[PDB]
Design a protein around this ligand. Structure first.
Ligand SMILES: *[C@@H](C)[C@H]1/C(=C/C2=NC(=C\c3[nH]c(C[C@H]4NC(=O)C(C=C)=C4C)c(C)c3CCC(=O)O)/C(CCC(=O)O)=C2C)NC(=O)[C@@H]1C
Ligand SMILES: *[C@@H](C)[C@H]1/C(=C/C2=NC(=C\c3[nH]c(C[C@H]4NC(=O)C(C=C)=C4C)c(C)c3CCC(=O)O)/C(CCC(=O)O)=C2C)NC(=O)[C@@H]1C
Ligand SMILES: *[C@@H](C)[C@H]1/C(=C/C2=NC(=C\c3[nH]c(C[C@H]4NC(=O)C(C=C)=C4C)c(C)c3CCC(=O)O)/C(CCC(=O)O)=C2C)NC(=O)[C@@H]1C
Ligand SMILES: *[C@@H](C)[C@H]1/C(=C/C2=NC(=C\c3[nH]c(C[C@H]4NC(=O)C(C=C)=C4C)c(C)c3CCC(=O)O)/C(CCC(=O)O)=C2C)NC(=O)[C@@H]1C
Ligand SMILES: *[C@H](C)[C@H]1/C(=C/C2=NC(=C\c3[nH]c(C[C@H]4NC(=O)C(C=C)=C4C)c(C)c3CCC(=O)O)/C(CCC(=O)O)=C2C)NC(=O)[C@@H]1C
Ligand SMILES: *[C@H](C)[C@H]1/C(=C/C2=NC(=C\c3[nH]c(C[C@H]4NC(=O)C(C=C)=C4C)c(C)c3CCC(=O)O)/C(CCC(=O)O)=C2C)NC(=O)[C@@H]1C
Ligand SMILES: *[C@H](C)[C@H]1/C(=C/C2=NC(=C\c3[nH]c(C[C@H]4NC(=O)C(C=C)=C4C)c(C)c3CCC(=O)O)/C(CCC(=O)O)=C2C)NC(=O)[C@@H]1C
Ligand SMILES: *[C@H](C)[C@H]1/C(=C/C2=NC(=C\c3[nH]c(C[C@H]4NC(=O)C(C=C)=C4C)c(C)c3CCC(=O)O)/C(CCC(=O)O)=C2C)NC(=O)[C@@H]1C
Ligand SMILES: *[C@H](C)[C@H]1/C(=C/C2=NC(=C\c3[nH]c(C[C@H]4NC(=O)C(C=C)=C4C)c(C)c3CCC(=O)O)/C(CCC(=O)O)=C2C)NC(=O)[C@@H]1C
Ligand SMILES: *[C@H](C)[C@H]1/C(=C/C2=NC(=C\c3[nH]c(C[C@H]4NC(=O)C(C=C)=C4C)c(C)c3CCC(=O)O)/C(CCC(=O)O)=C2C)NC(=O)[C@@H]1C
Ligand SMILES: C=CC1=C(C)[C@@H](Cc2[nH]c(/C=C3N=C(/C=C4\NC(=O)[C@H](C)[C@H]4CC)C(C)=C\3CCC(=O)O)c(CCC(=O)O)c2C)NC1=O
Ligand SMILES: C=CC1=C(C)[C@@H](Cc2[nH]c(/C=C3N=C(/C=C4\NC(=O)[C@H](C)[C@H]4CC)C(C)=C\3CCC(=O)O)c(CCC(=O)O)c2C)NC1=O
Ligand SMILES: C=CC1=C(C)[C@@H](Cc2[nH]c(/C=C3N=C(/C=C4\NC(=O)[C@H](C)[C@H]4CC)C(C)=C\3CCC(=O)O)c(CCC(=O)O)c2C)NC1=O
Ligand SMILES: C=CC1=C(C)[C@@H](Cc2[nH]c(/C=C3N=C(/C=C4\NC(=O)[C@H](C)[C@H]4CC)C(C)=C\3CCC(=O)O)c(CCC(=O)O)c2C)NC1=O
Lengths: 248, 164, 113, 177, 164, 177, 177, 164
């Protein structure tokens, strides 16, 4: 839980001023005003849609969820209203596979990649009982969304240091790309799909393109193979005074 | 060119004899395996400008010191000469998949290579790191078939052992 | 073309080790600096002595003394003089035995005990 | 994940067998020596903060170029991330010694670890050396042959737990090599 | 690397804007306060051996208990690693006076230091006593200029605050 | 990102050296004519609305099969996304002219761009011509040799500032080549 | 030079018999495994330069007197010849694995190698110790249990080609004894 | 060894003749030149541990990438073999000033070196950067005399041109 990259080599996460405006008697929030309000909206449009670069006549159908975001200043409600939009399902649901849609919900709304096939198959168990809005509100009303973001900050891609699987950091680095990438370049097909269902891992150059500036992006590659052999049993022995003991 | 055809002809031309039954028996193996290595070749031919971009970034990822002032990737006109020389090597692997042997890699890529890269202070370990990255970024049913990847990754293993 | 300092050292290595004591290892010589490290692992002459195996349970407390009577000097105050970009340092680590001196010592000072 | 009793019933599920009295005599001795498995893992978690810092700084001792400019334990930023990582490795092999099966070390900690290290730039030969110091200091606490810190046990052999945990530390080297 | 330039365009990129007419004023303050923080930096570069020899034994004159068995400076490479770690810190103080912000300190010296020094039993109060010795060793007409002592004794007690 | 002062710091930290008296004559001569860096980044972003419009409209007049059906900037949703891509390219160049170093141009713009312009079918041989039109227009604003918009300056030269920004447009012009 | 087909004809020519019957049915099953042999020669030629530099380095780490002044692998002229002497042995074993008969190994490489090495002053103890390392590498590559690289094959068993390649490498060590 | 004596003896042995008047005239050049090249060989043999270690870390001051994983300066053994292999080369230059030709450098350092530094993947431009640093470190009146430094540098860039 130290995480040497997070507030050092990246920026600080954006969001509303505090969470004490909810308990105020005569306001709803420290009111930003329309110069420090709309530049928070620029970071929700950049995070939920990828870098999709929505036009003026595509932003004109999100006027109702913005106008509510400047009254209730809840960030979880703005993200929930933008994921049930037509502009979220015409980019990430319409021309994609099912595990491509699921792996972008972990990117746009959690800042991590899915850790398992069992965690991924339960997201398709919620598709059968309520469609795509049952997937979206179960991510948003989870415990993992509460104790990292709350109503206060935008859901950003967080370098934690103490990931519950090491593979979770790998799929986070493939999903989040470099700056000036987007989520439409692969033609519908899921990047992480072979590695979730088999249990293998990712490619080192695809992860190190997305690391921040100052992290030795790519060195350490020996010129032999990049993954491990599960069938190999090596002999690793330790020297004692007399000989060498192979505690295998 | 080292091939299946030019090996059995030169073995019979040096002995002064006609093509016998064993010399025709080996051209039959050029028919039973032409299918696998030719759809490994047209897969590489149609998707070559995306592979040599991904491969040539793997040498400037591990050996990032080459863009320092003084080294072989010092300015801009020397960086695209590295991407040119990697596109040369991927084009010659396409020729060895067409011919059926290591001929176009021997005669055009390997012979005289170590004398050139030593005289011009080019590290041969970074003409390798772009090639060894292409060899392990190869999935078995996705990029090509099963036996098309065995052929394709054998001319990459040939170039790795020849530069080392 | 021998010398007096060389022949006074080697003549202590002709007694038996039940007699000569520390002088039984007086035939060993000074090697290059890289010979004392990890593939080769050549032994210095100080490691055959009982000074190399000194580890008492007692200790000086250093808060008994008056303030001003404990002195501390470094070897350098410079970071790339104490440890370079390579790991070849005279001061920090396991590479301080890689030096051109100190393969041999003076055990002809005292006695054959 | 699995433990030592769950590993037996997934072997019998491939043949649709019943776990009977032939197969149960390995599990009847896992509970018979089961006091000593607990008695060995609080010999490790009672000394775990000394064990990590000795293993990481003992790797700096045999390799002083890790703390020069250009080493990957150079600043405070990189050295605290190395100290965090050796505590994570020692945590997952104490779970695996407690269960009696190296499943949870192999899928959560070790799966995909080799690709993190060749993207961040972590040297893996010296990282194996920090694990191999803390392998050697883990068999000393279990067999009670450590030079300081004698703990109070009962008498007998724990020589099969000391080589079971030495094989869990050997899987970390085999997965990042 | 928090500088003056690397904050006004990390806010110009966070809203997707051009270099504003606000941010062309923030580099006009980089022209004014440079000549007190460059002249404080160049004084530290030609005097650094003498200021870290004096700062390091302010730890050991104060704390004689550190040579006890098991403490921080118990042998001679630990004394050599103590004077290294105060040679590193005032090198970063020299770096912060060049780029004008606290960027090189909190990226290379401060981040991690709560977690590193706790695990290795290195006391924070001995690190503070070396740096707080040379904060009031500064003599404002003698050593450097009047405002040059303000810049040099701003990064010093930034480090005394963040360590404590 | 690193600016022009923090580049000199990360070169000297590789040597573990203090920034002496020899490097400070390149940083006192950065801030000596450092008015002119502010006095010429202002004369890109004042004309930067017209500069992106004349860039891509001259990209049409030399490759007129872009507006043919099948061409990349055929319809209205693609002509708008081509217009904002010249905005983002011009934005991260004007950061790098303010910073003195191409660190914020290469990490936040050029990393992975040719990788994805082949993945969307953007013809990069005519996207280079999009950059190099506004390269020519920016270096005559700084030189004050434009036909219209004679912006009043102070007398001297910005011949080195005109060529530092021409190196920045050749960094993007070589990245997507 | 005999292959595996020339051996069963020489054996049949001694009694003047036509090849047919039971030894024609033993030959039809030799070619049924003919793709496993072709799959496995490729798994050694592909890794042939790392197999040699690891076996020569591993002979040196066991006996560091070969790189001392006066050692046999001391100078650069003699280091390059041991790296050449050691890959000719691997090259001639790959001929015998492809042919399925050790005749070409025994007469073009092994006949007189012991008298050659004890005439040049080459230690035959260390040459055996490098050949036995290359044996352990070739059985690991054929059975696909290398810890450094896993290849792609069809599923099945190739433990008879590992028993055969170990017999060729044992014969190299017994010949230069 | 290639020397002045062994050249004129081998030339008069292949011709099958006695030492002529021109073969004795060459050994007189070995007399008038021995004063300069034995001063350099004695200056080097007294201060060799400080010349080798000053040039051994001039490799890693130019190429800090050698401490990355998989490289040639990873661990303690690999830098012990690196400072050894530089000390081997400086011993052979001491042997070449004594003999008088490029004999010991050719047979013991250069022949077979291209095939070893490529098989073991040691970057040959880093066995050069230590040799090129010593050639420019030499002050021509300070360490040796004028003609002793001409002989010392001429054997130092023979080794550079043989690795390049
Ligand atoms: C980046 C990958 C490398 C690097 C590469 C460079 N290679 C350079 C030149 C070069 N390459 C070849 C071989 C190539 N040319 C061919 O005709 C064929 C086969 C048909 C092949 C494989 C040659 C012959 C040359 C020299 C002539 C030339 O310039 O093309 C090169 C230019 C060197 C120079 O101009 O001085 C570079 C920069 N360099 C790097 O930084 C990493 C190691
Ligand atoms: C914390 C101090 C524990 C403790 C741990 C043990 N360490 C044991 C062995 C050991 N420690 C080191 C590192 C040490 N040696 C060095 O050369 C340097 C500096 C460069 C350091 C810090 C090494 C290398 C080893 C040996 C491992 C090996 O041989 O590869 C150990 C084993 C038995 C013993 O020596 O006691 C233990 C138990 N010891 C303690 O009592 C406290 C609780
Ligand atoms: C080998 C590691 C030791 C050693 C071990 C033995 N321990 C034996 C018994 C034992 N240990 C504990 C405490 C343990 N059991 C628990 O349930 C918990 C925590 C909840 C802990 C820490 C107990 C209770 C016992 C049983 C004896 C008793 O109740 O007093 C033991 C006896 C064999 C057995 O009964 O299993 C051995 C040999 N003794 C040694 O000499 C080495 C160093
Ligand atoms: C080359 C990089 C190949 C590769 C070859 C393999 N080597 C295997 C085992 C092995 N290697 C050595 C030498 C090594 N050990 C040392 O102690 C030293 C230095 C002192 C060195 C250089 C030995 C002694 C052995 C083991 C012999 C035995 O088992 O008795 C091996 C086996 C399996 C595996 O490691 O996966 C292979 C395949 N390994 C690679 O990954 C690349 C492709
Ligand atoms: C124009 C006819 C009025 C007037 C309008 C203003 N409304 C402002 C904010 C606002 N309006 C609504 C209602 C509408 N927006 C919705 O999203 C929905 C439901 C889907 C409805 C019916 C809401 C909820 C809000 C608050 C959200 C927001 O802050 O924009 C408004 C701005 C005030 C402000 O910024 O606080 C104006 C000026 N006001 C007028 O004077 C004329 C008569
Ligand atoms: C295989 C066991 C894995 C797997 C790996 C993935 N590869 C991905 C993309 C990709 N791979 C290549 C190289 C390969 N394809 C080719 O066409 C050729 C040459 C003819 C080669 C060597 C390329 C060029 C690309 C990028 C193009 C694309 O978008 O597909 C990939 C997607 C993520 C990424 O690497 O960008 C994966 C996941 N895929 C699997 O399902 C199994 C598990
Ligand atoms: C401490 C209160 C003294 C003091 C002692 C030093 N002694 C040094 C070396 C040394 N001491 C002995 C005698 C010791 N060895 C024995 O076998 C017996 C009795 C059976 C005794 C009392 C010997 C033989 C040696 C030399 C052997 C060796 O060096 O290992 C010593 C080291 C000096 C040096 O080598 O520079 C010290 C400092 N010195 C003091 O100042 C107080 C008075
Ligand atoms: C120390 C013994 C090593 C070393 C370690 C470094 N690790 C760095 C980052 C890092 N490490 C891990 C793996 C760790 N985290 C986990 O969650 C798990 C499994 C549950 C493990 C094993 C991750 C995932 C990361 C990146 C995440 C993050 O830190 O934010 C690191 C920092 C590199 C940098 O600053 O660029 C270091 C230095 N490095 C060494 O040299 C020794 C050998
Ligand atoms: C002197 C005032 C101290 C003292 C210090 C010791 N520090 C030890 C190690 C150390 N110091 C640092 C921070 C330093 N390294 C850097 O790279 C930078 C910035 C670029 C800084 C400020 C680190 C990270 C470390 C640990 C790693 C190492 O050995 O280099 C140290 C040795 C630790 C140990 O004993 O195991 C000591 C003794 N000693 C004192 O008595 C006062 C408190
Ligand atoms: C001449 C260019 C300059 C000058 C240069 C300095 N050299 C300094 C130290 C120094 N130089 C050498 C190399 C030289 N001495 C040798 O013995 C040999 C070969 C046998 C060579 C090539 C060495 C080894 C050293 C370090 C030992 C020492 O002299 O203290 C020097 C002092 C600073 C430094 O440590 O480099 C300077 C200033 N000196 C001059 O006066 C003229 C102008
Ligand atoms: C920060 C880095 C960064 C950039 C540099 C740009 C790069 C960029 N451009 C486009 C997207 C595009 N880019 C172009 C551009 C061009 N086509 C042409 O004919 C011209 C040659 C050229 C510029 C005039 C076009 C036409 C599209 C639209 C393609 C589409 O609609 O699918 C996309 C995909 C966005 C999406 O729709 O999801 C991205 C990431 N955006 C970024 O985020
Ligand atoms: C096919 C159709 C077609 C066009 C749309 C124009 C587009 C166009 N304009 C200019 C050329 C220019 N563009 C500008 C920029 C501007 N000029 C002003 O008066 C404003 C202040 C500012 C924004 C409009 C300037 C100043 C030049 C002249 C060259 C220069 O001085 O840099 C160039 C030359 C760039 C080059 O040589 O590479 C081109 C192609 N020309 C064409 O052939
Ligand atoms: C907040 C916003 C902000 C700015 C816009 C600039 C504004 C600005 N520019 C200059 C000053 C100047 N500007 C120029 C530049 C030029 N003269 C020419 O004829 C060339 C065409 C052109 C080159 C690009 C020169 C030559 C000077 C004076 C010399 C100098 O100090 O650099 C000066 C100093 C006053 C002077 O020297 O006259 C100022 C305040 N500074 C700021 O702080
Ligand atoms: C000219 C180039 C050329 C080659 C490289 C080989 C390539 C090759 N290998 C096999 C086929 C095979 N190869 C293996 C070999 C192995 N499987 C293992 O599990 C072991 C690790 C390893 C060595 C024992 C096995 C078991 C088969 C299955 C068929 C068989 O048993 O013969 C096949 C047939 C199956 C298929 O079509 O996919 C082919 C073509 N043949 C050629 O003609």
């Amino acid at each position: 839980a130290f995480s040497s990259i997070q507030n050092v080599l990246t920026d600080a996460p954006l969001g509303t001023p505090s969470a004490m405006g909810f308990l105020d008697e005569r306001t709803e929030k420290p009111l930003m005003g329309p110069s420090e309000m709309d530049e928070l909206v620029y970071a929700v449009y950049k995070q939920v849609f990828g870098n999709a670069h929505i036009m003026e006549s595509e932003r004109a159908e999100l006027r109702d969820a913005e106008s509510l975001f400047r009254y209730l200043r809840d960030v979880r409600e703005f993200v929930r209203a933008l994921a049930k939009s037509n502009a979220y399902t015409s980019r990430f649901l319409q021309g994609n596979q099912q595990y491509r849609f699921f792996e972008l919900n972990f990117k746009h709304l959690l800042g991590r990649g899915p850790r398992s096939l069992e965690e991924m198959a339960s997201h398709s168990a919620l598709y059968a009982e309520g469609g795509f809005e049952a997937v979206i509100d179960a991510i948003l009303d989870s415990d993992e969304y509460a104790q990292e973001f709350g109503s206060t900050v935008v859901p950003y891609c967080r370098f934690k240091g103490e990931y519950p699987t090491n593979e979770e950091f790998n799929r986070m680095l493939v999903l989040k790309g470099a700056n000036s990438t987007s989520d439409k370049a692969g033609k519908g097909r899921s990047k992480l799909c072979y590695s979730i269902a088999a249990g293998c891992s990712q490619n080192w150059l695809s992860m190190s393109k997305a690391l921040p500036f100052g992290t030795e992006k790519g060195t350490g590659f020996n010129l032999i193979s990049s993954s491990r052999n599960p069938a190999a049993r090596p002999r690793i022995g330790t020297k004692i005074p007399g000989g060498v003991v192979f505690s295998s | 060119m080292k091939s299946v055809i030019t090996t059995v002809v030169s073995a019979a031309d040096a002995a002064g004899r006609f093509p016998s039954n064993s010399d025709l028996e080996s051209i039959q193996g050029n028919i039973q395996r032409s299918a696998a290595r030719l759809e490994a070749a047209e897969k590489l031919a149609g998707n070559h400008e995306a592979v040599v971009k991904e491969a040539g970034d793997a040498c400037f990822a591990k050996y990032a010191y080459l863009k320092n002032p003084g080294e072989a990737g010092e300015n801009q006109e020397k960086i695209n000469k590295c991407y040119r020389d990697v596109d040369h090597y991927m084009r010659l692997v396409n020729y060895c998949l067409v011919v059926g042997g290591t001929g176009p890699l021997d005669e055009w890529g390997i012979a005289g290579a170590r004398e050139v890269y030593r005289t011009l202070n080019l590290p041969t370990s970074a003409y390798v790191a772009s090639i060894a990255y292409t060899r392990d970024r190869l999935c078995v049913p996705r990029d090509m078939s099963a036996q098309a990847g065995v052929e394709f990754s054998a001319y990459l293993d040939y170039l790795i052992n020849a530069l080392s | 073309v021998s010398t007096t300092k060389a022949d006074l050292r080697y003549v202590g290595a002709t007694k038996p080790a039940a007699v000569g004591g520390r002088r039984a290892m007086n035939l060993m010589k000074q090697q290059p600096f890289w010979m004392y490290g990890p593939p080769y692992n050549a032994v210095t002459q100080d490691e055959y002595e009982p000074i190399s195996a000194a580890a008492p349970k007692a200790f000086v407390d250093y808060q008994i003394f008056a303030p001003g009577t404990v002195k501390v000097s470094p070897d350098s105050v410079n970071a790339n003089e104490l440890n370079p970009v390579s790991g070849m340092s005279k001061y920090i680590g396991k590479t301080q035995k890689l030096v051109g001196d100190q393969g041999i010592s003076d055990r002809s000072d005292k006695l054959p005990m | 994940m699995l433990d030592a009793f769950s590993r037996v019933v997934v072997n019998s599920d491939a043949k649709a067998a019943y776990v009977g009295g032939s197969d149960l005599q390995a599990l009847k001795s896992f509970i018979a020596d089961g006091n000593k498995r607990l008695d060995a893992v609080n010999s490790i978690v009672s000394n775990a903060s000394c064990m990590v810092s000795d293993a990481v700084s003992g790797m700096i001792c045999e390799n002083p170029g890790l703390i020069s400019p250009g080493g990957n334990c150079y600043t405070n930023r990189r050295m605290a991330a190395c100290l965090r990582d050796g505590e994570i490795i020692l945590r997952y092999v104490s779970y695996a010694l407690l269960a009696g099966d190296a499943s949870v070390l192999e899928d959560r900690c070790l799966n995909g670890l080799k690709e993190t290290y060749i993207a961040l730039g972590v040297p893996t030969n010296s990282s194996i050396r920090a694990v191999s110091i803390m392998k050697a200091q883990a068999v000393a606490f279990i067999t009670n042959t450590a030079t300081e810190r004698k703990m109070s046990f009962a008498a007998g052999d724990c020589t099969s737990l000391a080589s079971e945990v030495a094989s869990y530390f050997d899987r970390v080297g085999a997965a990042i090599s």
